[PDB]
Amino acid sequence: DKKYSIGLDIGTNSVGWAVITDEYKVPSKKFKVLGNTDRHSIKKNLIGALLFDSGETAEATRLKRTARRRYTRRKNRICYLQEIFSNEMAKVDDSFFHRLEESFLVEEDKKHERHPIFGNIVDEVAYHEKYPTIYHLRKKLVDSTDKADLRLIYLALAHMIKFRGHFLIEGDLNPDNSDVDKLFIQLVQTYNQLFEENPINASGVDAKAILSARLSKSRRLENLIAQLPGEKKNGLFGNLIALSLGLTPNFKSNFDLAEDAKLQLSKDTYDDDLDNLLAQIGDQYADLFLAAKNLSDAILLSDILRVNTEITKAPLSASMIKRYDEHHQDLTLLKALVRQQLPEKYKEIFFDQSKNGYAGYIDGGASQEEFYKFIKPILEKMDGTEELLVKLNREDLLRKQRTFDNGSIPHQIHLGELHAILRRQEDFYPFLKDNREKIEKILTFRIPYYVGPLARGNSRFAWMTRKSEETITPWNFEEVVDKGASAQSFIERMTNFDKNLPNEKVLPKHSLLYEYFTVYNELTKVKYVTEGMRKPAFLSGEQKKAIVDLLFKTNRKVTVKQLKEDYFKKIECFDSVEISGVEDRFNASLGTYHDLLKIIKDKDFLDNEENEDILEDIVLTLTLFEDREMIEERLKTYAHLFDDKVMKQLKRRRYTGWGRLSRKLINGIRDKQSGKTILDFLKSDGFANRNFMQLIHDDSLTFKEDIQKAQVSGQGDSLHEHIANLAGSPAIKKGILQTVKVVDELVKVMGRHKPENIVIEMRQITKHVAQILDSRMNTLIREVKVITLKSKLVSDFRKDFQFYKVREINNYHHAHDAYLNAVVGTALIKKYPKLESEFVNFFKRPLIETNGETGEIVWDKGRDFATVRKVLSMPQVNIVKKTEVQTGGFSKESILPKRNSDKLIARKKDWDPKKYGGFDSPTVAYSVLVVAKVEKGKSKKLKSVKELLGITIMERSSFEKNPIDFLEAKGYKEVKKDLIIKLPKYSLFELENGRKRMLASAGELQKGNELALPSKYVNFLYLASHYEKLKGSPEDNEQKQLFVEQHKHYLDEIIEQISEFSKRVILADANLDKVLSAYNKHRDKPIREQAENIIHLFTLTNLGAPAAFKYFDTTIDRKRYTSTKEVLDATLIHQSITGLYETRIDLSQL
RNA sequence: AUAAAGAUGAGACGCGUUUUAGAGCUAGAAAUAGCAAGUUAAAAUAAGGCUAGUCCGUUAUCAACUUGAAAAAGUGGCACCGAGUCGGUGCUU
DNA sequence: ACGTTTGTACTCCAGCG
DNA sequence: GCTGGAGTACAAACGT
DNA sequence: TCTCATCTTTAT
């Protein structure tokens, strides 16, 4: 029944906790120990920290999952092309697809001839001679008109299908135009033809170098207009140029159209927006936009095709053939020139795969930048290498075809080459003539966003709904999938539910009902006073309705002067009118009413009451959807009510935005007696004219009980689920959840007594922590107080009062920050209970500080300082590393090549790692203690053993299905199930003399002991290493410097401390001897440098993984415990989250 | 109202890696030496799973024991003197 | 006595734009 | 980056 | 690397 308090310091990787008293004294309690060990009770202190690894975002998982989906859909694409080709393929060469399938296989494992394409050596060699790359075949099948083998058509087809490029440019792309300057001259000619008053002169302009330059497109446009004599980027020529490069121009102010009329060529909406602009001004500018489109194609195609087009129909394949030819000629010239001038470095350049020469370029792993960096100094120290250097600075020397520049290739180039192939070979094989649009669709079918993963219901990420029950193919995607419903579900599954009624969706922000609510909610607070009126008056219902029907209904924005004149003096005949409660600018305006009115040109439609639901459906359609036909499909349900032009204007309009207040909140819930909803209340409340918040906070109204009935339904959520819906990074969420369970266990330990302070430090996230812990404790006034502090408030209490924190010494500092937090929070709430709103030098002055009424233990300047120093000097602090089963991916992602090892993991089931390579370095989920008998030696005796067998993440399910069979498959016989112990990572083992080790794997350990350095040495280290510079006053920091330069024996005493603690627990002999030798070597450096590097010295000592530290110039590599045989006969400790509750298992008894 | 950042989800490219294909030639008995060539493709890209889908498979949660279908629940006196990872003393239980 | 096993110290390595 | 896996070279220890 | 949606939080 002793009053207490809890201090907490929450971090991304650590949560510290402590318990304070009113005397500010960490209590010490005896706790019972379970298990089979001799020890039964441990006195432990009520201060400690929990350490864990950081919680990870789901972005990496989303990236991996999207990659898996892309590989599955690509394999489906080759599968579809194979089903198309199969019937004739069996006629010409059966099992060709089979030979391609088993291409990744050795000859011992294949079932056909090793050559994939033709099935014999001679035609394979002849094919590789005729087409050295696949682009040679692609250019041939596009250009030639003779009949070719079906295998070659399929090969080019599947290459085009598998690497089909990007979908960033929507519309059509015509590769026939590729000259930037020719279409620039055409643009100038068309502009001068239409516009004669101010013609544009652009003769003598290097259009190719400007418009295809490598810098940004905005600066490209700026460079272009700077050269232009007397033109503006906002002008017509500048706007056309910006439209050609792709930056969106505004055509409003130039044609004076009063609508934005933005045109972007990469968007499919541009055709209909161009139709809009043609309807606005006429068709005489259509040739100008056509020439702008051609000029855009000239810019966007010359950067990648870089070849003549008048001679071929596949200019990308022509570009790759040209690149191969330049590579061949330049390689021949380079080989001859190196063999002539520098014959010694021919084996390095052309034979050595380890170096970054041409052998490293081709056979090795060297990239293009690395090879250029290697070969450029070689070319400088030679003659006749001017052209090679010219192409090297242009990044066009010895270039590969499958390079990273291929990411900018549109899918239109591959589609056009594919179309050319089908048009050339349709007359010989009729099946491509009959299946032409099928293959073109297979390339150009991309599942849209707003359509979920094409599932049936066993998916957690899917929202897509089905019209039929047929399998979704590339061709019946628009017949099985309801695209409008799926897009609505896409928007709705992420949009919010309103907080008052959690099972109901929100309306769009530009809904007219929300707009009526906002306009009326602002109008009901409108105050006005007139001459002759004693007190100013809430507006009555007819007054507010008249304002809405005149000033609001005519003007988009209504000001105070408009009210005071146009209603109050014009109609109410009051001139001396003043207002309050509102500003000059009304926050709520009825924008959607005016915009929709200007769309339709009808006023009697909207002011009717029975049609408002259909207009709500139009604003829903205009907020949800951003495909044009997918808006038009929903607008076609109301096709009868308006004109064609009206709904083209409706289709053209779009509202982005969602509100937070739903519609059954407004025209829904109603009083049990009156039967009017809150909008009907807000239309005519009476003299009271109350607004929304009180109508949801009125005790007499039944709205209050309905919304609490809505909030109670569902019972909120569980602790982890309520943690999940919060904002912020998942790591801080993990820290908060550990904090909540730490508080729960701390309350449990004390005898189920709750403390009337909980002190927290880490803004809105912290207010949410205060909310959840306040709800957990007080179960509605705050019987338990929750106080949130800041890092500055304790940093000050440490810098001013010599309570410095060297974090590199030990992990006790989280617990000590928590205890301090408790100290200062309780002292502040006792000292100033008036200033609890912001939280829920008093440290001459009285020795026992007091507020003046009940300052009993506010801050006594004696005792309390001594007690806080004793607490911060306490050797025993329960540091707990949270034991975690490691999850994630199994093994490193690198596919290492073939070698004769047992540590290579197979990439499939039939892929023997010695033959096919495989992954390596698996990750253990947890280790298990196996006590069995393994056959040893050639006499195969049942030698009983006790070993740790680490279960990797890939084998966790197989182990947990049946441990006995899995251990017997490993080789352990007569296994004893009752002694199988699940040992996760960070499991603690106490071996001898207090030496504790934490499990890292089945073959490695971590140091698990903490160095409690005497606090005098800690303060001397912090002052001497100048940690956080110097915060004391010049006299005080002068005395601190004197302290530093007079207690220099502390340096050797701390070295003795590290040496003693290392020789007791951290059994690293050589590193400790190097530590002492390097201390003796640098014993003459100034005290600051020495103490800072002694602060570095604690890495040999800190709990966790051993890591390399650096003492001045000497660095020491880590001592690692690369076998776990010692903890097999040690005391295994199971620790609670606070660690006060323990269970010790003596493993040497098993 | 504007901007930035973060979180979550979906749709897409490009590259990398791996095994195989792209008959290497001459002088020798070989070791090896000299020369020629090099730019591409197929397949896989977590093993795999059943619910067999253009699905899912690397996030969050996780001391022990007991009740357990699970979720979840239950399981362990206090005070004082001190401090090298917590120890000792007394009483109740 | 001597031939396989475990410790110890050191090195490199880790899918990305 | 961290930190756990793997290979290598070499010696001490175990076991036959 | 690319495209898109939804939300929140902070600063102005």
The region, left, alpha or beta by phi > 0 then psi within -120 to 50, assigned to residue A1135 is beta
Residues 6+ apart with CB under 8 A from A915: A106, A109, A898
Q: What are the two backbone dihedrals, phi and then psi, of residue A168, each rounded to the nearest 5 degrees?
A: -75, -25
β-bridge partners, A466: A481
| Rounded Cα distance, A537 and A523, in Å | 13
Method used for this model?
A: cryo-EM
> Concatenated DSSP letters for A502-522?
TTSBPPBTT-HHHHHHHHHHH
Compute CA A416 distance to the chain's CA centroid, rounded to the nearest angstrom.
37
| Rounded Cα distance, A105 and A917, in Å | 12
Cα–Cα nearest to A555, from A467, A565, A453: A565
Residue type present at position A360: G
Cα–Cα nearest to A577, from A541, A542, A548, A547: A547
| Rounded Cα distance, A278 and A266, in Å | 19
Cα–Cα nearest to A235, from A262, A207, A255: A255
The answer to whether A936 CB sits below 7 Å from nucleic acid chain C is no
Q: Is residue A343 classed exposed, middle or buried when 0-12, 13-18 and 19+ CB atoms within 10 A define those classes?
A: exposed
Q: Which two tokens stand for residue A823?
A: 């100290």
User: Is A149:A92 a contact under the CB 8 Å cutoff?
Assistant: yes
Q: What are the two backbone dihedrals, phi and then psi, of residue A878, each rounded to the nearest 5 degrees?
A: -75, 90
Measured between alpha carbons, how far is residue A100 from residues A72, A123, A353 in Å? Answer: 18, 16, 29
A406 nearest nt, CA–C1': B14
Cα–Cα nearest to A292, from A251, A348, A352: A251
Long-range contacts (CB closer than 8 Å, 24 or more residues apart) made by A945-948: A945/A972, A946/A1128, A946/A1150, A947/A1128, A948/A983, A948/A1002, A948/A1003, A948/A1124, A948/A1128
Cα–Cα nearest to A1129, from A1001, A992, A932: A992
Helical spans, DSSP H, in A381-496: 386-393, 411-425, 430-434, 436-444, 477-480, 483-494
Residue type present at position A480: V
Helices vs strands, H then E, count in chain A:
47, 23
Cα–Cα nearest to A498, from A697, A666, A613: A666
Q: Which two tokens stand for residue A186?
A: 């055409």
Listing from the earlier edge strand, what are the strands of the sheet with A28-35?
A41-45, A28-35, A1142-1146, A1131-1135, A988-990, A996-999, A1005-1007
> Residue written as tokens 């100013």?
A536
A937 nearest nt, CA–C1': D16
Positions in chain D where some atom is under 7 Å from a protein CB: 2-7, 15-16
> Is the alpha carbon torsion for A717, A722, A725, A726 positive or negative?
positive
Full 3-state SS string of A313-343: CCHHHHHHHHHHHHHHHHHHHHHHHHHHHCC
CA of A885 to C1' of C12 (A): 28
Residues 6+ apart with CB under 8 A from A735: A10, A11, A12, A13, A14, A15, A55
Q: Is A148 helix (H, G, I), strand (E, B) or coil?
A: coil
User: Is A6:A17 a contact under the CB 8 Å cutoff?
Assistant: yes
A986 nearest nt, CA–C1': B63
| Rounded Cα distance, A414 and A687, in Å | 73
> Residue written as tokens 């079918």?
A445
> Concatenated DSSP letters for A636-668?
GGGTTTS-HHHHHHHHH-----B-SS-STTTTT
Q: Which two tokens stand for residue A834?
A: 């008036």
> Concatenated DSSP letters for A562-621?
HIIIIITTTTS---SEEEESS-SS-S---HHHHHHHHHH--STTTT-STTHHHHHHHHHH
The answer to whether A447 CB sits below 7 Å from nucleic acid chain E is no
The answer to whether A873 CB sits below 7 Å from nucleic acid chain E is no
Residue type present at position A1051: L
β-bridge partners, A580: A527
| Rounded Cα distance, A885 and A924, in Å | 9
Full 3-state SS string of A352-404: CCCCCCHHHHHCCCCCHHHHHHHHHHHHHCCCCCHHHHHHHHCCCCCCCCCCH
CA of A957 to C1' of B46 (A): 16
The answer to whether A494 CB sits below 7 Å from nucleic acid chain E is yes
| Rounded Cα distance, A540 and A543, in Å | 5
Measured between alpha carbons, how far is residue A558 from residues A149, A549, A567, A626 in Å? Answer: 76, 12, 11, 32
User: Is A41:A30 a contact under the CB 8 Å cutoff?
Assistant: yes
Residues of chain A (810-869) having a beta carbon less than 7 angstroms from strand C: none
Angle formed by the axes of helices A644-652 and A591-600, nearest 10°: 140
Q: Which two tokens stand for residue A244?
A: 């050609």
Q: Which two tokens stand for residue A1075?
A: 């530590």
Q: What are the two backbone dihedrals, phi and then psi, of residue A829, each rounded to the nearest 5 degrees?
A: -70, -35
Q: Name the active-site residue from A9, A181, A297, A817.
A: A9
Strands of A132-237, DSSP E: none
**Fold entry, domain A5-55+729-881:** Nucleotidyltransferase; domain 5 (3.30.420)
Residues 6+ apart with CB under 8 A from A11: A735, A762, A814
User: Is A307:A325 a contact under the CB 8 Å cutoff?
Assistant: no
| Rounded Cα distance, A474 and A462, in Å | 19
The region, left, alpha or beta by phi > 0 then psi within -120 to 50, assigned to residue A457 is left
Compute CA A840 distance to the chain's CA centroid, rounded to the nearest angstrom.
34
Q: Which two tokens stand for residue A1115?
A: 């660095």
Residues 6+ apart with CB under 8 A from A522: A582, A586, A587, A588
| Other C-beta atoms lying within 10 Å of the C-beta of residue A226 | 11
Compute CA A560 distance to the chain's CA centroid, rounded to the nearest angstrom.
47
Helix (H) or strand (E) holding A703: helix A703-712
Measured between alpha carbons, how far is residue A324 from residues A331, A397, A1142 in Å? Answer: 10, 10, 71
CA of A473 to C1' of B12 (A): 18
The answer to whether A1105 CB sits below 7 Å from nucleic acid chain D is yes
The answer to whether A1070 CB sits below 7 Å from nucleic acid chain C is yes
Q: Is A451 helix (H, G, I), strand (E, B) or coil?
A: coil
User: Is A199:A192 a contact under the CB 8 Å cutoff?
Assistant: yes
Positions in chain E where some atom is under 7 Å from a protein CB: 1-10
A31 nearest nt, CA–C1': B76
β-bridge partners, A658: A508
User: Is A93:A119 a contact under the CB 8 Å cutoff?
Assistant: yes
| Rounded Cα distance, A715 and A616, in Å | 32
Strands A5-10 and A758-761: what pairing?
A: parallel
Positions in chain C where some atom is under 7 Å from a protein CB: 6-11, 13-15, 17
| Rounded Cα distance, A357 and A335, in Å | 12
β-bridge partners, A990: A996, A1131
Binding residues of A for Mn(2+): 9, 761, 814, 1082, 1113
What separation, in Å, do the N-terminal and C-terminal C-alpha atoms of chain A show?
Answer: 43
CA of A452 to C1' of B10 (A): 7
- Return the DSSP state at A550: I
Instruction: Decide if A9 is catalytic.
Output: yes
- Angle A762-A768-A772 (CA atoms, 0-180°, nearest 5)? 105
CA of A923 to C1' of D5 (A): 9
**Where in chain A are all domains bearing CATH 3.30.420?**
5-55+729-881
Which residue has its C-alpha nearest to nucleotide B15's C1'? A404
> Is the alpha carbon torsion for A313, A316, A317, A321 positive or negative?
positive
Q: What are the two backbone dihedrals, phi and then psi, of residue A157, each rounded to the nearest 5 degrees?
A: -65, -45
CA of A339 to C1' of B27 (A): 22
- Return the DSSP state at A548: I
| Rounded Cα distance, A122 and A134, in Å | 18
User: Is A489:A638 a contact under the CB 8 Å cutoff?
Assistant: no
Q: Is residue A999 classed exposed, middle or buried when 0-12, 13-18 and 19+ CB atoms within 10 A define those classes?
A: buried
User: Is A1108:A1099 a contact under the CB 8 Å cutoff?
Assistant: yes
